[PDB]
Amino acid sequence: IVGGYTCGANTVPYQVSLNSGYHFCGGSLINSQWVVSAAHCYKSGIQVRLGEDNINVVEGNEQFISASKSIVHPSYNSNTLNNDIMLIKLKSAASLNSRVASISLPTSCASAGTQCLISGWGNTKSSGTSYPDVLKCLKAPILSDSSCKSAYPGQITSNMFCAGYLEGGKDSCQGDSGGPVVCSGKLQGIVSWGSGCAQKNKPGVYTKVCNYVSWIKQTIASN
Ligand SMILES: N=C(N)c1ccc(Br)cc1
Ligand SMILES: [Ca+2]
């Protein structure tokens, strides 16, 4: 997250860190046994880390649970990043509390101009590299589909939205991949892609979770 703020320990209780010997992606806890992330975050050997603030220190609220199964969307296209969503099942259910909590799926798609919270442990610089150890937050609005399509001609599908600031300076970035975009207490987006980070006229692009609710619910019900 570039141009964000330190969230505060366990203030974003649905945030997870995907760990394969190191943090590599975010995710969102959607019930006691399932995480949603980006399909581009797929790999085998995932450990889900819940309750994290400093990903380098054991602070005492963590739960570390191995993935039993990963399901990448059947129509994910790694060239276009269309359908950039994946489900991870935990080997055992998480213990839910005020610091480890599920985030609700949306019943409605969020409108342009809605303010959302994006979070993650990704790079904090638009130029060069600085990875924070503690969770970073950013408040950003969803942009109109026309401003999103004008920023990324020929690249925005109906399964994507833009959020952020056309002026630059404030965005998600590498390492925030798979993390949540939460609006009005519902998961609306997944950190998916963008051109650089925090560049002028190049906002973040996020998977539009409201289009996937039936797939998520039917997948969870049968797996
Ligand atoms: N929001 C962005 N600019 C961004 C997000 C994820 C990745 Br990976 C790269 C760029
Ligand atoms: Ca920790």
Curated annotation (Swiss-Prot):
Name the predominant localization: secreted
Where is it located?
Secreted, Extracellular space
Q: Does the keyword Membrane apply?
A: no
- Annotated Gene3D superfamilies: Trypsin-like serine proteases (2.40.10.10)
What the entry lists under CDD domains is as follows: Tryp_SPc
* Regulation (activators, inhibitors): Is inhibited by scorpion cyclotide trypsin inhibitor TopI1.
Q: Which GO terms describe its cellular component?
A: extracellular space; serine protease inhibitor complex
Q: Where does substrate bind?
A: 171-172, 174-175, 177
Provide a GO biological process annotation.
Answer: digestion
Give the binding site residues for Ca(2+). Answer: 52, 54, 57, 62
What is annotated as the active site? Answer: 40 (charge relay system), 84 (charge relay system), 177 (charge relay system)
In what way is this protein post-translationally modified?
A: Subsequent cleavage after Lys-125 leads to alpha-trypsin. Further cleavage after Lys-170 yields pseudotrypsin. A cleavage may also occur after Arg-99. Not sulfated on tyrosine residue(s).
Names of the cofactor(s): Ca(2+)
Domain Peptidase S1 span(s) in chain numbering = 1-221
Q: What is the recorded name of this protein?
A: Serine protease 1
**Originating species:** Bos taurus (Bovine)
Its gene is PRSS1
